[PDB]
Amino acid sequence: AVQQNKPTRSKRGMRRSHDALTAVTSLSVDKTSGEKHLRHHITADGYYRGRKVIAK
């Protein structure tokens, strides 16, 4: 139903321990534009694996 005692700030510090967000470090590079696109994701300008596939 509800709490009985007030959990300390120390207890909360352990609850959010696993709440740490993660970095990606999966930064791939383009071959032509050399831009920094994610793995398997197209670039900003629409280049992917050395090909202007987005046509934009």
Partner 1 sequence: MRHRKSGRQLNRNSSHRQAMFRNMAGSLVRHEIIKTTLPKAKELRRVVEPLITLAKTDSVANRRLAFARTRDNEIVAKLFNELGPRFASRAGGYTRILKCGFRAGDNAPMAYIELVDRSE
Task: Note the residues at the interface with RNA (CB under 7 A).
Answer: 1-7, 11, 18, 21, 24-29, 31, 38-40, 48-50
C-beta separation of 35 from 50 below 8 A: no
Select from 7, 40, 45, 50 the one that contacts partner 1 (CB under 8 A): 40
For the bound state, the minimum distance from the C-beta of residue 8 to partner 1, rounded and expressed in Å, comes to 34
C-beta separation of 25 from 14 below 8 A: no
34: phi > 0 → left, psi -120 to 50 → alpha, else beta; which?
Answer: left
Where along the sequence are the contacts to partner 1 (CB under 8 A)? Answer: 40-42, 48, 53-55
